[PDB]
Short mmCIF file of C-alpha atoms and ligand atoms in Angstrom, two decimals:
data_model
loop_
_atom_site.label_atom_id
_atom_site.label_comp_id
_atom_site.label_asym_id
_atom_site.label_seq_id
_atom_site.Cartn_x
_atom_site.Cartn_y
_atom_site.Cartn_z
CA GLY A 1 8.66 -13.70 18.07
CA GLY A 2 6.08 -10.89 16.68
CA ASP A 3 8.50 -8.74 16.12
CA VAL A 4 7.79 -6.87 12.92
CA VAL A 5 10.94 -6.25 10.34
CA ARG A 6 12.21 -5.69 7.02
CA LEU A 7 14.55 -7.76 5.07
CA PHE A 8 17.16 -6.11 3.14
CA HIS A 9 19.35 -7.93 0.81
CA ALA A 10 22.91 -6.91 1.52
CA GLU A 11 24.66 -7.28 -1.98
CA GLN A 12 21.43 -6.06 -4.02
CA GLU A 13 20.90 -3.31 -1.54
CA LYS A 14 16.89 -3.75 -2.01
CA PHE A 15 14.04 -4.91 0.68
CA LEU A 16 12.26 -7.73 0.31
CA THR A 17 8.76 -6.73 -0.60
CA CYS A 18 5.35 -8.25 -1.59
CA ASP A 19 2.84 -6.48 -3.83
CA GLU A 20 0.19 -6.90 -6.64
CA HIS A 21 1.27 -6.75 -10.58
CA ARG A 22 -0.80 -7.34 -13.28
CA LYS A 23 -3.56 -7.84 -10.70
CA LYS A 24 -1.60 -10.62 -8.98
CA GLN A 25 0.54 -10.91 -5.93
CA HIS A 26 4.26 -11.22 -6.04
CA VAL A 27 7.52 -11.42 -3.88
CA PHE A 28 10.64 -9.51 -4.77
CA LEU A 29 13.18 -7.20 -4.12
CA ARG A 30 12.36 -3.80 -4.80
CA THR A 31 14.65 -1.45 -6.93
CA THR A 32 14.98 2.12 -5.52
CA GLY A 33 16.11 5.54 -7.39
CA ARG A 34 16.97 6.98 -3.94
CA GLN A 35 20.63 7.83 -3.46
CA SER A 36 20.30 5.93 -0.02
CA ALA A 37 18.74 2.05 -0.33
CA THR A 38 17.68 2.37 3.48
CA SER A 39 15.80 5.08 2.79
CA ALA A 40 13.58 3.23 0.68
CA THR A 41 10.79 2.21 3.34
CA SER A 42 7.79 0.98 1.99
CA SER A 43 4.53 -0.63 4.24
CA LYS A 44 4.51 -3.23 1.65
CA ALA A 45 8.00 -4.32 2.92
CA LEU A 46 6.98 -5.10 6.34
CA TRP A 47 7.11 -8.78 7.75
CA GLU A 48 6.02 -10.16 11.05
CA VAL A 49 7.99 -12.65 12.26
CA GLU A 50 6.54 -16.11 13.53
CA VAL A 51 8.37 -18.89 15.49
CA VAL A 52 7.18 -22.29 14.49
CA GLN A 53 8.94 -23.96 16.78
CA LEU A 54 12.26 -22.57 12.89
CA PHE A 55 10.52 -19.28 11.39
CA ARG A 56 7.49 -18.34 9.14
CA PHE A 57 7.59 -14.70 7.70
CA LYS A 58 3.75 -13.04 7.84
CA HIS A 59 3.33 -9.83 5.12
CA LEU A 60 1.74 -7.43 7.30
CA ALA A 61 0.10 -5.29 4.74
CA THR A 62 -2.11 -8.59 3.09
CA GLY A 63 -2.12 -11.08 5.53
CA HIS A 64 -0.36 -13.58 3.44
CA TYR A 65 2.98 -15.59 4.23
CA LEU A 66 6.17 -15.68 2.46
CA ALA A 67 6.87 -19.24 0.47
CA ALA A 68 8.65 -20.75 -2.13
CA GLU A 69 7.34 -22.81 -5.04
CA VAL A 70 8.47 -24.37 -8.38
CA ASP A 71 8.46 -21.94 -11.22
CA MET A 72 17.49 -22.27 -9.69
CA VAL A 73 13.97 -24.39 -9.77
CA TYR A 74 11.71 -22.54 -7.22
CA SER A 75 10.87 -18.92 -6.64
CA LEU A 76 9.87 -17.00 -3.77
CA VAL A 77 5.73 -16.29 -3.59
CA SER A 78 2.96 -15.29 -1.53
CA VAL A 79 0.35 -17.31 0.18
CA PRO A 80 -3.31 -17.28 1.85
CA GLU A 81 -2.42 -18.96 4.53
CA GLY A 82 0.72 -20.13 7.18
CA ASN A 83 0.26 -23.80 7.35
CA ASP A 84 1.98 -25.42 4.82
CA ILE A 85 5.58 -26.22 5.29
CA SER A 86 6.46 -24.47 2.25
CA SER A 87 6.08 -21.12 4.25
CA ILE A 88 8.84 -22.39 6.85
CA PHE A 89 12.44 -20.99 6.68
CA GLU A 90 15.56 -21.37 8.46
CA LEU A 91 17.88 -18.63 9.57
CA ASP A 92 21.84 -19.27 8.96
CA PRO A 93 23.87 -16.35 10.25
CA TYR A 94 23.06 -10.88 8.53
CA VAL A 95 21.36 -13.86 8.02
CA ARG A 96 20.51 -16.55 5.02
CA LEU A 97 17.31 -17.93 4.49
CA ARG A 98 17.20 -21.82 3.75
CA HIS A 99 13.52 -23.15 2.47
CA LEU A 100 13.10 -25.99 4.82
CA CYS A 101 10.90 -27.62 2.46
CA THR A 102 13.11 -27.98 -0.23
CA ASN A 103 16.44 -27.28 1.54
CA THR A 104 17.26 -24.39 -0.97
CA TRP A 105 19.02 -20.99 0.04
CA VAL A 106 16.98 -17.43 -1.11
CA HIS A 107 18.88 -16.58 -4.16
CA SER A 108 18.50 -12.90 -5.89
CA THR A 109 17.91 -12.54 -9.37
CA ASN A 110 17.99 -9.88 -12.00
CA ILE A 111 14.99 -11.45 -13.92
CA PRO A 112 12.66 -8.40 -13.66
CA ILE A 113 8.65 -8.93 -13.02
CA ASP A 114 7.27 -5.58 -14.69
CA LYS A 115 8.58 -6.19 -17.75
CA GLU A 116 6.32 -3.98 -19.89
CA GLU A 117 6.90 -1.10 -17.40
CA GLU A 118 9.79 1.30 -18.65
CA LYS A 119 12.95 0.55 -16.12
CA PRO A 120 11.05 -2.09 -14.06
CA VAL A 121 11.87 -2.30 -10.44
CA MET A 122 10.19 -5.95 -9.21
CA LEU A 123 13.18 -8.15 -9.63
CA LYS A 124 12.37 -11.98 -8.93
CA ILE A 125 13.92 -14.11 -5.98
CA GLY A 126 14.67 -17.41 -6.19
CA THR A 127 16.17 -20.14 -4.35
CA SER A 128 19.54 -22.11 -5.34
CA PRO A 129 20.65 -25.45 -4.13
CA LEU A 130 23.87 -23.92 -3.57
CA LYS A 131 24.56 -21.80 -0.04
CA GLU A 132 26.05 -18.45 -1.55
CA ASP A 133 27.82 -16.03 0.38
CA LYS A 134 26.62 -12.28 -0.96
CA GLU A 135 23.14 -13.89 -0.71
CA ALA A 136 22.60 -12.54 3.10
CA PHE A 137 20.00 -10.37 4.63
CA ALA A 138 20.09 -7.64 6.99
CA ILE A 139 17.31 -8.07 9.65
CA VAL A 140 16.17 -4.23 10.13
CA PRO A 141 13.84 -3.67 12.80
CA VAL A 142 10.87 -1.54 12.67
CA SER A 143 9.61 1.13 15.22
CA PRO A 144 6.40 0.27 16.75
CA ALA A 145 4.98 3.55 15.51
CA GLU A 146 5.31 2.34 11.88
CA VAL A 147 3.52 -0.73 12.88
CA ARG A 148 0.71 1.23 14.58
CA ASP A 149 0.55 3.64 11.47
CA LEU A 150 0.01 0.55 9.23
CA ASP A 151 -2.65 -0.79 11.32
CA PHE A 152 -4.51 2.31 11.32
CA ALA A 153 -4.35 3.01 7.41
CA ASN A 154 -5.04 -0.69 6.66
CA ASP A 155 -8.24 -0.44 8.50
CA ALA A 156 -9.12 2.91 6.92
CA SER A 157 -8.61 1.70 3.53
CA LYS A 158 -11.18 -0.94 4.58
CA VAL A 159 -13.92 0.80 5.90
CA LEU A 160 -13.36 3.53 3.26
CA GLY A 161 -13.53 0.52 0.37
CA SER A 162 -16.54 -0.92 2.23
CA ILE A 163 -18.69 2.29 2.64
CA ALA A 164 -17.60 3.21 -1.13
CA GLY A 165 -19.04 0.19 -2.43
CA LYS A 166 -22.58 0.63 -0.75
CA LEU A 167 -22.65 4.38 -1.72
CA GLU A 168 -22.09 3.17 -5.52
CA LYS A 169 -25.10 0.95 -5.02
CA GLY A 170 -27.31 3.59 -3.60
CA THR A 171 -26.87 4.83 0.18
CA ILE A 172 -25.52 4.29 3.97
CA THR A 173 -27.12 4.05 7.16
CA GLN A 174 -26.92 7.00 9.82
CA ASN A 175 -23.67 5.17 11.46
CA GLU A 176 -21.96 4.15 8.40
CA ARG A 177 -22.21 8.32 7.15
CA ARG A 178 -21.21 8.97 11.02
CA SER A 179 -18.40 6.51 10.67
CA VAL A 180 -16.83 7.50 7.71
CA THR A 181 -17.01 11.04 8.28
CA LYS A 182 -15.06 10.62 11.63
CA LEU A 183 -12.65 8.57 9.82
CA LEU A 184 -11.76 11.09 7.28
CA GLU A 185 -11.14 13.91 9.78
CA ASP A 186 -8.83 11.13 11.69
CA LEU A 187 -7.08 10.58 8.27
CA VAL A 188 -6.55 14.64 8.10
CA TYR A 189 -5.16 14.55 11.80
CA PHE A 190 -2.94 11.52 10.53
CA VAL A 191 -1.66 12.71 7.69
CA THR A 192 -0.61 16.16 9.09
CA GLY A 193 1.21 14.61 12.14
CA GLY A 194 -2.06 16.30 13.90
CA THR A 195 -1.52 19.86 12.99
CA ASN A 196 -4.80 20.19 11.08
CA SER A 197 -8.18 18.42 12.23
CA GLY A 198 -10.12 18.98 9.05
CA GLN A 199 -13.05 21.15 10.94
CA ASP A 200 -12.29 24.31 9.39
CA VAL A 201 -10.64 26.14 6.53
CA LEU A 202 -8.64 28.80 8.28
CA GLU A 203 -6.43 26.08 10.54
CA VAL A 204 -5.05 25.25 6.73
CA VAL A 205 -2.11 27.56 7.02
CA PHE A 206 -0.62 25.82 9.74
CA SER A 207 -0.37 22.32 8.03
CA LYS A 208 2.70 20.33 8.31
CA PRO A 209 2.82 17.04 6.30
CA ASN A 210 4.00 13.41 7.49
CA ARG A 211 5.77 12.24 4.46
CA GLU A 212 5.91 8.55 5.71
CA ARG A 213 2.29 8.95 6.08
CA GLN A 214 1.49 10.68 3.04
CA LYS A 215 3.28 7.62 1.17
CA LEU A 216 1.19 5.46 3.46
CA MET A 217 -2.29 7.07 2.33
CA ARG A 218 -1.04 5.83 -1.43
CA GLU A 219 0.41 2.48 -0.58
CA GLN A 220 -2.47 0.81 1.43
CA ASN A 221 -4.98 2.34 -0.99
CA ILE A 222 -6.53 4.81 0.85
CA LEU A 223 -6.44 7.43 -2.03
CA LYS A 224 -7.73 4.85 -4.53
CA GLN A 225 -10.67 4.45 -1.98
CA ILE A 226 -11.02 8.13 -1.59
CA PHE A 227 -11.67 8.53 -5.24
CA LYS A 228 -14.26 5.63 -5.18
CA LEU A 229 -16.17 7.43 -2.94
CA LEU A 230 -15.85 10.79 -4.99
CA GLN A 231 -17.33 8.75 -7.92
CA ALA A 232 -19.67 6.73 -6.21
CA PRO A 233 -22.66 9.68 -6.48
CA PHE A 234 -21.81 9.75 -10.33
CA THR A 235 -22.07 6.28 -11.18
CA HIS A 236 -27.38 16.37 2.11
CA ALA A 237 -24.93 18.37 4.38
CA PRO A 238 -23.76 15.03 5.66
CA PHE A 239 -22.96 13.95 2.10
CA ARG A 240 -21.21 17.35 1.20
CA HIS A 241 -19.06 17.11 4.63
CA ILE A 242 -17.87 13.88 3.55
CA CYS A 243 -16.96 14.95 0.01
CA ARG A 244 -15.36 18.00 1.64
CA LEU A 245 -13.28 15.74 3.94
CA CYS A 246 -12.16 13.51 0.93
CA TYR A 247 -10.68 16.62 -1.05
CA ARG A 248 -9.04 17.78 2.59
CA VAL A 249 -7.47 14.66 2.65
CA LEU A 250 -6.15 14.36 -1.04
CA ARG A 251 -4.76 17.96 -0.50
CA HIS A 252 -2.70 17.11 2.75
CA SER A 253 -1.66 13.80 1.36
CA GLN A 254 -0.18 15.23 -1.85
CA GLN A 255 1.07 18.53 0.27
CA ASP A 256 4.93 19.16 -1.00
CA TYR A 257 5.10 15.71 -2.28
CA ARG A 258 5.77 15.07 -6.09
CA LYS A 259 4.98 11.66 -6.19
CA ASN A 260 1.45 11.91 -4.71
CA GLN A 261 0.65 15.32 -6.55
CA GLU A 262 1.13 13.02 -9.81
CA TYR A 263 -0.47 10.11 -8.46
CA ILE A 264 -3.67 12.04 -7.34
CA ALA A 265 -3.54 14.30 -10.38
CA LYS A 266 -3.78 11.05 -12.63
CA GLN A 267 -6.33 9.70 -10.64
CA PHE A 268 -8.44 12.39 -10.69
CA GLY A 269 -8.31 12.57 -14.54
CA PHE A 270 -9.09 8.84 -14.67
CA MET A 271 -12.02 9.32 -12.62
CA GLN A 272 -13.42 12.50 -14.52
CA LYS A 273 -13.16 10.34 -17.76
CA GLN A 274 -14.91 7.16 -16.34
CA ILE A 275 -17.81 9.33 -15.15
CA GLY A 276 -18.01 11.15 -18.57
CA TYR A 277 -17.91 14.74 -18.78
CA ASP A 278 -21.17 15.29 -19.99
CA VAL A 279 -22.80 13.18 -17.07
CA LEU A 280 -24.34 16.36 -15.70
CA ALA A 281 -25.83 17.79 -18.98
CA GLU A 282 -27.68 14.53 -19.73
CA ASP A 283 -28.61 14.14 -16.17
CA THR A 284 -30.48 18.06 -16.70
CA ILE A 285 -32.01 16.66 -19.54
CA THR A 286 -33.49 13.63 -17.83
CA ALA A 287 -34.78 16.02 -15.24
CA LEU A 288 -36.31 18.54 -17.13
CA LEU A 289 -37.84 15.80 -19.44
CA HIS A 290 -39.33 14.56 -16.01
CA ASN A 291 -40.90 17.72 -15.41
CA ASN A 292 -38.08 18.96 -12.93
O1 I3P B 301 12.65 13.16 -6.06
P1 I3P B 301 11.24 13.05 -5.25
O2 I3P B 301 10.38 14.18 -5.96
O3 I3P B 301 11.51 13.33 -3.88
O4 I3P B 301 10.58 11.68 -5.44
C1 I3P B 301 11.11 10.47 -5.41
C2 I3P B 301 12.10 9.52 -5.79
O5 I3P B 301 11.12 9.31 -7.29
C3 I3P B 301 12.53 8.40 -5.73
O6 I3P B 301 13.30 7.96 -6.40
C4 I3P B 301 11.26 7.52 -4.96
O7 I3P B 301 11.92 6.27 -4.47
P2 I3P B 301 11.62 4.65 -5.05
O8 I3P B 301 12.76 4.88 -6.39
O9 I3P B 301 12.00 3.84 -4.45
O10 I3P B 301 10.42 4.68 -5.71
C5 I3P B 301 10.43 8.30 -4.16
O11 I3P B 301 9.37 7.47 -3.60
P3 I3P B 301 8.43 7.20 -2.36
O12 I3P B 301 8.17 8.28 -2.01
O13 I3P B 301 7.42 6.29 -2.71
O14 I3P B 301 9.92 6.86 -1.35
C6 I3P B 301 10.00 9.38 -4.95
O15 I3P B 301 8.65 10.30 -3.48
#
């Protein structure tokens, strides 16, 4: 009741996760390339248990609930609210999950959701009328720290996205600018496990990255929002300060982390193209035409 956990499929050696694909939310078992299945820990695999009176599972990263509906005949899905009876499951002990509403048991499949992708990693999950034996889940407890971290990252992501949208449309208030400035500094402190504050350049020599947090920055769309912020002015001193901090968060988010380096370099390339390579030349001509 209130506990946060990961649901690890024993036979498949994959965690039950929920993420967006093709601009849609999907529930699935995630294939990992790691040589240690239990090390493939994603914030998108965190579920908060709710005691009905038997159980409901709330996807912490999106607030939606685990459910099942006709697509084995049914398939696990994500739903906006936890009111329907379709989001209620029964645990039968390692535990097997029975979907009350349909009286079916959670069963894994090899049907990938990300077809187009080379070597897909999203495997659909359904329910079978028969109670299998190799379709059990290990309930993996999640540490309070990881939960607190997700809560902060989730809030940060919303603030950055919000402020970014406003900045795209023009400008922001003094408080919003002050808030985003403080948040970016907090993000530096956060991702470097407190080794850097982001207040000066000299301290960079002692920065040490917290890998799980760097990963969180990417997964919870913090990095995505940062680029949105960087792009906004192309679509004073405090503004430059905000941009400097944006690049600082990017720096520590990719520090000694190959996956984030490629992700960030890719997003930077996209932003550059989206902005246009001639935006400054065109702007200078326009300014001169208006005698400036
Ligand atoms: O070999 P490297 O350079 O360490 O890179 C890791 C490798 O690609 C893992 O397979 C991947 O896990 P998944 O296959 O489960 O994605 C992990 O992602 P993560 O950092 O997002 O866990 C990468 O960081």
